[PDB]
Design goal:
This is part of a larger assembly, with chains A, B, C, D, E and F.
Chain A (H helix, E strand, L loop, with lengths): L1 E3 L5 E3 L13 H5 L8 H33 L1
Antiparallel strand pairs in A: 1-2
Chain B lengths: L1 E3 L3 E3 L36 H19 L31
Antiparallel strand pairs in B: 1-2
Chain F lengths: L1 E5 L21 E6 L7 E6 L12 E5 H11 L2 E2 L3 H13 L1
Antiparallel strand pairs in F: 1-2, 3-4, 3-5
The chains are: A mainly alpha, B alpha+beta, C alpha+beta, D little secondary structure, E mainly beta, F alpha+beta.
Chain A binds two RNA strands through helix 1 and helix 2.
RNA sequence: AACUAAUCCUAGCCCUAGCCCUACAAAUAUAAUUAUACUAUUAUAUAAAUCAAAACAUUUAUAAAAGUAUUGGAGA
RNA sequence: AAUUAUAUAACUUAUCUAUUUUAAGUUUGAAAUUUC
């Protein structure tokens, strides 16, 4: 199933077979599938980082384009 | 195996894999194939293809005859549960 | 770059797309609609005009609502709009005097009220204003149902409203068990608040609860593709027979 | 000071009738923002000696009111 | 996550890795006895690492239990523990547990309990002795080491005599 | 109940804007607080008998918490809702 | 005409514009990345100060009307 | 030190509680201002 990690990302969680149920498994309950409140700042950074990646990519293409004009 | 009390190893026969080795006598398939043999275009099998090849003819004949009902869906190959089979399709409980 | 939509519009986009769009319209309307709470500690300005000091001319005036802090304990109780006011005070009500940090605490109490709809007596944190409001509402059950969420100012009261609304909606025999005749009177007495069952379920639900509820509603066991093909094959064959 | 009682200990939604509160049982994992589900007793399908508990003496068939001193 | 170190399941008089489990409820009815006055023998006066005063092993019937030692307890002494409120003065042997009703005014006492059944909590330190200031009917006045004079029911148990190391308060 | 008013007027933000609060706008004047005052009067019906404040069955106006802390808490008084009020008068009519 | 060295142009970047966003297996929060039970499971109060007032104390920004008026150790 | 010192804390009155016939004073001082 799809589950949210402590970092706020959504990732497919592969279920594991256990001899005991989840509610009786303290260690499985100890595993964290919840995101902390401070992750909101990180979420904004992730969106900004994605935009930054696109901006940097355009700069990389521009440098390649310079030689294309110079060569041709 | 399982380690019991007193730090003693106790091998479990059930958990020890048994290698099922096929009989290769009379088997004509070998590691390599002829260059004379034309290459095969990949046509992966799908649920639609499997259903069409095997299940469709049975239902088609039965539907025209009118002998179709929900209770007989298993007759055409539906499995209500995967329990009882050594190899369970989902959840996968068998190794390669 | 720069975000085309401001941060406040980001929430709107989520509400308009995804599982939020699939949420029931009645619940969405309840979430979307906002009703101002009834003033309790602040009154509107008596006069609508005053002399502007800077230009020496008469000018329109505005009302500044007093800041009031409502602790979460109020959401677990039934407060009549009262809340903790945190701020500064000037002794003797003259600005020339010393400023003292003061936290003003309304007198809080825990008392028991009988609910006809639920046929049970609930002991809850309450204030004197709520008790008067209950009398003004013509009963504790009426007060919960009649009062809006903002004026009610209680999550538990909304929880009571959800149960009361659902109970009235369903005509559930659970009301006043073994007294069917008494049950009818209560439903007739609170007939005004009868609503569809679906709407009553979502009354007072939190956003996290609502999202989980919709997820639970929309989650369905995967369809065996054998069944899907069987129905498709039968449907196509049936059409051919026609 | 002699302590009576172990010294170690020394220094709403559910109430609604006709509706069921949502719980993280569907999530299959604990989350603080959801109500704790009500779990029926678990059945392992087999008896584990490591987790087995001996029955009380009185429930034993061989239990006798008279005390036998050994 | 905090578990007290005094977590031994079974009360024992053998030193425990050593610490000896003390008993401050003097009149605990012992095995093979009715809830009536019973007598005990001071087996040995040992040293308690965790308490300033020295503990004397008091043994009676089928039960052996450590207790705080008074000023004159020595090995082989006889200690009586009575619940009955004596019509006349009850024979007083230092270290015996008797109701305050039985004892006469002026007798030095220790290991007293503020309330009946509370157990010994005061006058357990070295050289501490409680004076029975006054006695009236079912009420008595017990002076605790804190200098607080309190009035308690005669049912409260008090141990006669001062605590060991009689010169603890006189230490220079 | 507590009532407070800002000492310093907040500059008008116009028809459709929010004024920006400042430190001097954060100091407030207490026009009236029930805590400093003695308890205000409250209307209640005595459901029992209390010393020298009347007898059961009368309607008395008493200070809010003095009545609440003593009378209502002990059960001596009760709140007069319209539903029980009409029952009371009907019961009193039969009395 | 010699040694040590030097020579070069793209590696890439910067700002606006435009645009929101909705980009293998196996192992893992236990001791993270340890294929099955242990042990229940959990962030955050005005942002302050520095700084300016040549120190320091209330105080110190973070379309036109208009830098007009008021406010302010009437001073920054 | 001088001068104040409704931080608090106490008492008195309110306060809030029982019964029943924090605020305002004062005091300490968290401190404040200036001088030495």
């Amino acid at each position: 199933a799809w589950r949210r990690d402590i970092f706020g990302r959504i990732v497919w969680h592969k279920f594991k077979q256990w001899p005991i149920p989840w509610y009786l498994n303290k260690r499985y309950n100890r595993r964290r599938f919840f995101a902390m409140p401070y992750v909101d700042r990180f979420i904004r950074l992730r969106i900004e980082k994605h935009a930054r990646i696109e901006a940097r990519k355009r700069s990389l293409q521009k440098k390649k384009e310079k030689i294309l004009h110079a060569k041709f | 195996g399982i380690y019991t009390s007193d730090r003693k190893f106790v091998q479990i026969k059930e958990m020890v894999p048994e290698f099922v080795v096929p009989d290769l006598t009379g088997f004509k398939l070998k590691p390599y194939v002829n260059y004379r043999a034309p290459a095969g275009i990949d046509t992966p099998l799908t649920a639609k293809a499997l259903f069409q090849e095997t299940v469709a003819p049975a239902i088609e004949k039965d539907f025209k005859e009118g002998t179709f009902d929900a209770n007989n869906l298993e007759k055409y190959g539906f499995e209500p549960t995967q329990e009882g089979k050594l190899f369970q399709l989902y959840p996968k409980n068998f190794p390669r | 770059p720069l975000h085309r939509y401001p941060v406040h519009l980001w929430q709107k986009l989520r509400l308009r797309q995804g599982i939020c769009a699939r949420l029931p319209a009645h619940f969405l309307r309840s979430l979307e609609e906002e009703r101002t709470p009834t003033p309790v500690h602040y009154k509107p300005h008596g006069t609508k005009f005053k002399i502007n000091p800077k230009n020496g001319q008469r000018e329109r005036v505005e009302d500044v609502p007093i800041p009031v802090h409502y602790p979460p304990e109020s959401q677990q109780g039934l407060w009549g709009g009262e809340g903790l006011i945190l701020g500064y005070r000037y002794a003797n009500n003259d600005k020339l005097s010393k400023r003292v940090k003061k936290v003003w605490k309304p007198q809080l109490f825990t008392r028991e009220l009988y609910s006809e709809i639920l046929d049970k007596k609930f002991t809850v944190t309450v204030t004197m204003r709520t008790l008067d409001l209950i009398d003004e509402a013509y009963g504790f059950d009426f007060y919960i149902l009649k009062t809006p969420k903002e004026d009610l100012g209680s999550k538990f009261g909304m929880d009571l409203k959800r149960g009361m609304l659902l109970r009235l909606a369903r005509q559930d025999p659970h009301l006043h068990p073994e007294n069917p005749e008494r049950r009818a009177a209560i439903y007739d007495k609170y007939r005004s608040f009868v609503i569809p069952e679906a709407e009553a379920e979502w009354v007072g639900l939190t956003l996290e609860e609502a999202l989980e509820k919709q997820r639970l509603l929309e989650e369905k066991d995967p369809v065996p593709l054998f069944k899907v093909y069987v129905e498709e094959l039968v449907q196509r064959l049936q059409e051919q027979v026609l | 000071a002699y302590e009576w009682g172990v010294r170690s200990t020394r220094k709403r939604v559910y109430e609604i009738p006709g509706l069921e509160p949502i719980t993280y049982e569907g999530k299959k994992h604990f989350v603080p923002w959801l109500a704790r589900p009500i779990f029926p007793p678990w059945e392992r399908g087999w008896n584990d000696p490591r987790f087995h508990r001996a029955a009380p003496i009185h429930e034993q068939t061989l239990y006798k009111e008279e005390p036998c001193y050994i | 996550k905090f578990v007290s170190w005094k977590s031994r399941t079974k009360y024992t008089v053998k030193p425990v890795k050593n610490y000896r489990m003390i008993d401050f409820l003097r009149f605990r009815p012992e095995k093979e006895k009715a809830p009536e006055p019973f007598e005990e023998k001071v087996v040995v006066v040992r040293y308690d690492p965790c308490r300033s005063a020295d503990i004397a092993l008091v043994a009676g019937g089928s039960r052996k239990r450590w207790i705080i030692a008074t000023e004159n307890m020595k090995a082989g002494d006889t200690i009586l523990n009575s619940n009955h409120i004596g019509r006349m003065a009850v024979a007083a042997q230092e270290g015996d547990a008797h109701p305050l009703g039985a004892l006469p005014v002026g007798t030095l006492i220790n290991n007293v309990e503020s309330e009946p059944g509370r157990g010994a909590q005061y006058i357990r330190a070295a050289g501490t002795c409680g004076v029975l200031l006054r006695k009236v009917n079912g009420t008595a006045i017990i002076q605790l080491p804190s200098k607080r004079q309190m009035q308690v029911l005669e049912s409260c148990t008090a141990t006669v005599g001062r605590v060991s190391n009689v010169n603890h308060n006189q230490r220079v | 109940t507590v009532i407070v008013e800002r000492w310093w007027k907040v500059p008008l933000a116009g028809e459709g804007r929010k004024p920006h609060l400042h430190r001097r706008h954060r100091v407030y004047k207490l026009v009236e607080d029930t805590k400093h005052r003695p308890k205000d009067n409250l209307e209640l019906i005595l459901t029992q008998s209390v010393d020298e404040i009347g007898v059961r069955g009368d309607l008395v106006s008493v200070k809010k918490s003095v009545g609440r802390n003593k009378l209502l808490s002990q059960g001596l008084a009760v709140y007069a809702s319209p539903e029980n009020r009409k029952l009371f008068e009907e019961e009193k009519s039969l009395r």
